[PDB]
Design a protein around this motif. Structure first.
Motif: not given
Length: 70
Positions: A12, A15, A31, A40
């Protein structure tokens, strides 16, 4: 893995985030399971002076996630 396609949902764009007593930013959490699939890492905002897109999904999301004002 199974299919030789481009690449499904590739991580994404931001995060999590850590603000300061100034109510501003300071650090961000990014992440990436598709990549390493484990753990992460955190990176500061100033470095995201090229992740315009990534920052873009985040901002657009800043409204939805939690939802307050800052």
């Amino acid at each position: 893995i199974s299919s030789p396609k481009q690449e499904e949902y590739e991580v994404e764009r931001i995060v999590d985030e850590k603000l300061d007593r100034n109510g501003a930013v300071k650090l961000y959490r990014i992440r990436w399971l598709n990549y390493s699939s484990r753990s992460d890492t955190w990176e500061p905002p100033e470095n995201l002076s090229g992740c315009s897109a990534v920052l873009a999904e985040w901002k657009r999301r800043k409204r939805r996630l939690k939802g307050s004002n800052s």
